RNA sequence: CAGACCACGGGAUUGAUAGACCAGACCUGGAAGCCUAGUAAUAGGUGCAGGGAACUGGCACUAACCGGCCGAAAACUUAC
RNA sequence: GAGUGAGAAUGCAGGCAUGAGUAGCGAUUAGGCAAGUGAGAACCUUGCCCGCCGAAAGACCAAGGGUUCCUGGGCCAGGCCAGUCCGCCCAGGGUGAGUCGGGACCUAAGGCGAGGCCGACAGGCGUAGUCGAUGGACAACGGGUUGAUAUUCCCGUACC
RNA sequence: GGUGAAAAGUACCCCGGGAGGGGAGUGAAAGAGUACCUGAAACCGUGCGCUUACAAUCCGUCAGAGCCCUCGACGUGUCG
RNA sequence: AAGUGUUUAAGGGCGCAUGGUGGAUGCCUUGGCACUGGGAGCCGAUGAAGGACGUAGGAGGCUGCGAUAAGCCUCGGGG
């Protein structure tokens, strides 16, 4: 098994789907390429995703003593976390529900020999 | 109008998969002796120092 | 120049006129200005027409520029530094450089500068 | 338009129409005060 | 001039693609300044003037980048 | 011995999906640039420019709200986005009157009303009275000051 | 309403502005981290296996090709 | 020379593994419900019931208590 390091960004104030939109971009790529794509991705969800990927890389470097250049985004996924319920008033005094969703973005970077 | 049936999982996901981001095409730029990746669109700006590469 | 094909840049023709005038004033003042790429694209012909008037240094061209710029300091800057500077350059007095988009709306951004290589 | 809502606040009128003195004036209002006191209302009246 | 978001032309300049610039065309209609005539409104000369866009030519002056992604055969049976 | 079996009651509650990353993001003014701050800025600060109202979209009183005011901090909730900002969050501070507006002065409509009259009881009225401003009477104006109060504080000069 | 027996409530270091994590430590257990006993379904992912872009499907049921694992004759892949 | 022929998954389905959300289930409890046996069966102009505002060194709620204000005195219990 490849030496892996984990990083979970929990309760991120972004939808699980909107985090997944960029996690799909940077799943499978090396850590460096993933961070570059998340740097130049126009989606705002790329910033928490980039931060959690970089945290996984930092854990691999410091807590695990792995070579940062050999790291790769092995398994990354955003699960949906808690959802706050808000009320938006609409016409005729009718209250519609608004969902302030969060996401847990889990990242596991492995150190693979190219 | 209003949706008459609940959409099946297969259809919902088939048509939801189309809401995907397109990864930017990154080219190499040498700035401050370092090789960074920037869009070819921002290649000139990065060379001239008009891109914040952090 | 050629008119804006699509909806005017400031949300109206009057606002587009005022916005191009302000952008030209700012460009002639600070050398380079960062603004949304569409504004830079619309300004570059506008600004270069003003610089052409400046190059044709005359009272008539001064009046033609002042009917758009309205800033006497920037008009003097044009007719005393930018016209003489571009006397030898035939067109292409401005340069658009595409830069990163804004964090609040992802608007395409561009820095429009005055050419200086000569 | 005529967008006048039903409730037009007025503290003096609120006190003079639903206040403690008016409630205690009549046995029915005294009954209301007693019923609220038994229910446990913190605000027995306006 | 192709377009809701595609695809078509040009381009990693071995380039007129767009803009600018220079002309032409065309539209307006005689600019500003100065001079002259009128106590003035205003008129006349400078002068087919000035201004300006889409069309047409020139012109690499500005931007088309010292760039990244995709993108090749499993073979077998049967006459000459 | 049963609160003993749910899939239906346009059943009830809680959590979620579908539409959907869709509509919308709330007028009829409009923002731009430079610099700053900051991790982060279309939205905050500053400087210009531009635009909008201007019998107001300016400045006050009243009602109503109740601390939302000022200073310093905060930015995971709210703000239809973000936010370093905010009427949001936290702490502290802030409201100074013989003259202003009220009460201590009057009464109007109306209310309540000692007794009282009427009414099986409950109570309905009501006199004397007593409340009751939206009205009457009633002595102060300029200037300055604070981060936040100002005919209140201060200065000058007035009036019960 | 429910952390834990006991706050012993995670020192210290690292990524991060924080939030949140990763080491480390406490604990019998953080598969107990003040979002906390157990942690169902709905619902939402990620990984793997088969399948699916000539097809008309109350979505199943009966046959059923083709694609992995449990015991052995045999000695090794074709049977049951 | 004609014919035969596996080979893709933008996405989807099924299943398994592994998670998240959520708060069901199980086991509980600080709280209720229904009663049993007793006490007392009234309080108040010596101002009741119930409250408003205050009160502790520090902000608020609940509790207690009233400018003697989480309290004062006397008598008892306990250490």
Swiss-Prot record, chain A:
GO terms for biological process: translation. The chain holds residues 6 to 119 of 153 of the full protein. This protein binds specifically to 23S rRNA; its binding is stimulated by other ribosomal proteins, e.g. L4, L17, and L20. It is important during the early stages of 50S assembly. It makes multiple contacts with different domains of the 23S rRNA in the assembled 50S subunit and ribosome. This is Large ribosomal subunit protein uL22. GO terms for cellular component: cytosolic large ribosomal subunit. Keywords: Ribonucleoprotein, Ribosomal protein, RNA-binding, rRNA-binding. One of its GO terms (molecular function) is structural constituent of ribosome. Belongs to the universal ribosomal protein uL22 family.
Curated annotation (Swiss-Prot), chain B:
GO terms for biological process: translation. It comes from the Bacteria. Keywords: Ribonucleoprotein, Ribosomal protein. Residues 1-19 are annotated as: Disordered. One of its GO terms (cellular component) is large ribosomal subunit. Pfam families: Ribosomal_L32p (PF01783). SUPFAM superfamilies: Zn-binding ribosomal proteins. One of its GO terms (molecular function) is structural constituent of ribosome. Residues 1-18 have a biased composition (Basic residues). The keyword Transmembrane does not apply. Belongs to the bacterial ribosomal protein bL32 family. HAMAP family: Ribosomal_bL32 (MF_00340). This is Large ribosomal subunit protein bL32. It comes from Mycolicibacterium smegmatis (strain ATCC 700084 / mc(2)155). The gene is rpmF.
From Swiss-Prot, chain C:
GO terms for cellular component: cytosolic large ribosomal subunit. The keyword Cell cycle does not apply. GO terms for biological process: translation. It comes from the Bacteria. Keywords: Ribonucleoprotein, Ribosomal protein. The chain holds residues 2 to 119 of 199 of the full protein. This is Large ribosomal subunit protein bL17. Belongs to the bacterial ribosomal protein bL17 family. The keyword Iron-sulfur does not apply.
Swiss-Prot record, chain D:
One of its GO terms (biological process) is translation. One of its GO terms (molecular function) is structural constituent of ribosome. PROSITE patterns: RIBOSOMAL_L34 (PS00784). Pfam families: Ribosomal_L34. InterPro entries: Ribosomal_bL34 (IPR000271), Ribosomal_bL34_CS (IPR020939). Keywords: Ribonucleoprotein, Ribosomal protein. GO terms for cellular component: ribonucleoprotein complex; ribosome. NCBIfam families: rpmH_bact. HAMAP family: Ribosomal_bL34 (MF_00391). Belongs to the bacterial ribosomal protein bL34 family. This is Large ribosomal subunit protein bL34. It comes from Mycolicibacterium smegmatis (strain ATCC 700084 / mc(2)155).
